Amino acid sequence: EADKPLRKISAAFKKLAIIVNSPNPEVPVTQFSHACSLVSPLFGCLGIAFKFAEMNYVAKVDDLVRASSSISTLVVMMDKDIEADCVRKAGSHTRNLLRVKRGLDMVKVLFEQIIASEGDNSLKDPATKSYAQVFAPHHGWAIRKAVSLGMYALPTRAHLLNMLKEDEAAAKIHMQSYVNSSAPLITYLDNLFLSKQLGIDW
Ligand SMILES: CCCCCCCCCCCCC/C=C/[C@@H](O)[C@H](COP(=O)(O)O)NC(=O)CCCCCCCCCCC
Ligand SMILES: CCCCCCCCCCCCC/C=C/[C@@H](O)[C@H](COP(=O)(O)O)NC(=O)CCCCCCCCCCC
């Protein structure tokens, strides 16, 4: 109890889904960055092959955590970056947010594909399909090929759930929860970008 990462995730993101759906939504950077850090333990359930993905995501979340001590909300964070004209500058808060947002969407589609792929001990199909939908349009060739290689170093479905410390029943519940919770959040984040004419495809 409390060594169950899927449950720390579902709880944290259900709070954010309430904030985002309520009127006049103000998403705190502390609260947002914390929930994003709760995804990081999902790496280290994967092989050593995905340590390049783990470092990149964690580094970006660390930045958002570091930003959370000076910046009030996510909106304020983006506004400050527009005003400093560094939105697309490498390592900026807003740019990291966009990549992190894709990371959340990646987890979402993966959970969706995993739940569907029940009766198959291979994570090859869910992982491949989900990466193709979320990250393939944004990653260069070398990154995409390195990823397809790392797909062979993936654990089995049973072993993933074992390391996540859940049986099939509980896992499918807390995964479906995140999928439900993250959807309005991803939409909210997408809209922050679109409503400010920043785009989301860069
Ligand atoms: C269980 C199935 C796992 C499928 C494989 C997971 C897919 C993650 C592959 C991402 C490779 C990260 C290397 C790419 C780095 C950069 O090119 C970009 C842009 O960075 P910038 O130049 O702006 O500094 N980084 C990203 O797009 C961040 C993506 C990391 C988020 C990964 C989420 C993994 C989802 C959960 C996996 C436990
Ligand atoms: C070390 C790996 C050895 C395998 C080499 C054989 C693989 C066949 C490569 C087929 C050609 C790849 C198609 C080219 C895609 C281009 O769009 C990209 C540039 O766009 P972006 O990456 O941003 O999507 N091509 C590249 O970035 C380089 C293509 C790699 C070609 C083989 C690399 C081997 C280099 C050997 C150097 C001594």
Swiss-Prot record:
Cited Gene3D superfamilies: Glycolipid transfer protein
Family in the record: Belongs to the GLTP family.
GO cellular component, one term: cytoplasm
Keyword check for Transcription regulation: no
SUPFAM superfamilies in the cross-refs: Glycolipid transfer protein, GLTP
Species annotation: Arabidopsis thaliana
UniProt entry keywords in alphabetical sequence: Cytoplasm, Lipid transport, Lipid-binding, Transport
Gene deletion effect: Constitutive expression of defense-related genes that accompany the hypersensitive response normally triggered by avirulent pathogens. Induction of growth inhibition, premature leaf chlorosis and defense-related programmed cell death (PCD) at the early seedling stage, leading to a lethal phenotype before flowering. Large increase of cell death inducer phytoceramide.
Record-listed an N-acylsphingoid base 1-phosphate binding positions: N56, K60, R95, R99, H139
Protein name: Accelerated cell death 11
Phylogenetic placement of the source organism: Eukaryota, Viridiplantae, Streptophyta, Embryophyta, Tracheophyta
Role summary: Exhibits selective intermembrane transfer of ceramide-1-phosphate (C1P) and phytoceramide-1-phosphate. Does not transport ceramide (Cer) or GalCer, suggesting a requirement for phosphate in the headgroup for functionality. Transports in vitro sphingosine, but not glycosphingolipids. Also has some in vitro activity with sphingomyelin, a lipid not detected in plant tissues. The transport function may be not directly involved in regulating cell death.
Outcome following mutation: K60A: Severe reduction in C1P transfer
Superkingdom to which the source organism belongs: Eukaryota
Single GO MF descriptor: lipid binding
A matching Pfam family: GLTP
Gene Ontology biological process terms in this record: cell death; defense response to bacterium; response to salicylic acid
Miscellaneous: The clustered Lys-60/Arg-95/Arg-99 residues form a positively charged triad ideally arranged for binding phosphate, explaining the inability to bind sugar headgroups and transfer glycoproteins.
Compartment list: Cytoplasm
Quaternary structure (record): Interacts with BPA1, PRA1F2 and PRA1F3.
Gene: ACD11
